[PDB]
């Protein structure tokens, strides 16, 4: 099997990136994101990307999944912005929440032109980079209910 | 409005509604016609298997009988799910490296025959990766017809590194049918093949060390298992239990010179940029029914460790519901309004025709 004349001949192209950039324009959560240095946090709630109030940043429900966008000045230019996007997966988050967090992390990457570097942060396996965003972390029992309907 | 998710496997249809945690209809992708030489679909063909010859309209992930595939889709909508397809945006799945005409005809039939309002054709392995909650990893997907490796980095598949093998569950079933004759048991017909498939799913396993396991099986009966046939006859199977899926690691068992699944996985990783291989090695995700053999994850871990640098962390992820990971990833993505924004609408199809599928579905 070769790529030519196949259904992956358009993967990796400018057209793929164009189509996905356009799709990311339809998520209200990204409007105004990554405009200044700081940490922005959303939680997945029944497939939706919901902002977390600033006063609660750093507290994470073990039952839930989150997207954390860290905006900072890169070494190359003190007046420009670079991005780390972490998605945080609670020990008890459900499969719909983690999958949506993963997909929407890519979408936020798309929205920001591919610049963000992505980090998968499972509870108990959080990277040094992630830990350093909260100089700390507070894990809370509970979380919001799955968006899945359970097929009996 | 609820989207339909239809994972059209070579062997099984998995169909249901976006937002559900599992497919509501799972049935064999078969059309049956009288063995004595007007048709039956799915479970009802399996129900009349005694008088029918069974044909699969998908071979190695490619639709080769479009008339019978239409029957399968019609059965899925009207007889199983009991929905009107013109009311439901529909997500379909496909193996990577299929010829472009396959999804062109998928799109044509969905819009012109079933009048769906919108549709999308997704690469199965990408859906499995998201179902596992990852954006980076390498999926080994193995069903009834296709085994493929797709490495994915930050949500984008790396097309130059995608690997595909025409060796999957149906070949393993056929091989089990053949070697069960060395023991005296005759399985030859399309009906008998489904009995052997069941033996395979219930009793086979991947040996951690194939040579040692063959010697264990020759020394005593400790690895033998009994299996009750429909007529009540109890047969005994021994080294066939692990010789059958050994073929995935040694394709020469069925006369193929191909690399085994451990080598194709390694080779796929090695076609990726050096600095991301680390993340692929630590995130090998298994997907599909032919990855359900007991022992397969441990064997993959052993074999990849032998091929990879000694300092490399290797991890095989084997989700317990991986028979349905592709479908579940589809259920998640089809629940997202931004993903559905990318779908082909009927108006867009009326303007552009089948070629639009390649400009919208990635
Ligand atoms: N427990 C099991 N152990 C081994 N094989 C199994 C098991 N359960 C199912 N299978 C095989 O898995 C295959 C069906 O898996 P599935 O992932 O549904 O394939 P598919 O999607 O229909 N085909 P494909 O077009 O290749 O993706 C058949 O060959 C089954 O016999
Ligand atoms: Ca939750
Ligand atoms: Ca990026
Ligand atoms: Mg499949």
Numbering used by the authors:
A (entry chain B): 7 to 141, 144 to 160
B (entry chain A): 5 to 41, 51 to 375
Sentences from the paper on this structure:
Actin is one of the most abundant proteins in eukaryotic cells and plays essential roles in various cellular activities, including locomotion, division, and transcription control. The dynamic assembly of actin is controlled by the hydrolysis of ATP, bound to the center of the molecule. Upon polymerization, actin undergoes a conformational change from the monomeric G-form to the fibrous F-form, which is associated with the flipping of the side chain of His161 toward ATP.
Despite the absence of the side chain of Gln137, the polar interactions in the active site of Q137A_AMPPNP were highly similar to those of sWT_AMPPNP, and His161 was in a flipped conformation (χ1 = 61° and χ2 = −84°). As a result, W1 loses its direct interactions with actin residues. In addition, WOε1 does not bind directly with actin residues. Judging from the configuration of W1 and W2, Q137A appears to have ATP hydrolysis activity comparable to the wild-type actin. The polar interactions in the active site of Q137A_ADP-Pi were highly similar to those of cWT_ADP-Pi, and His161 was flipped (χ1 = 64° and χ2 = −89°). In the crystal structure of Q137A_AMPPNP, the two water molecules replacing the side-chain atoms of Gln137, WOε1, and WNε2, had a continuous electron density and were separated by only 2.5 Å (indicated by an arrow in Figure 7D). Thus, the replacement of the Gln137 side-chain atoms by the water molecules, WOε1 and WNε2, may disturb the hydrolysis reaction because of the increased fluctuation of the water network in the catalytic site in which the two water molecules, W1 and WOε1, do not bond directly to any actin residue.
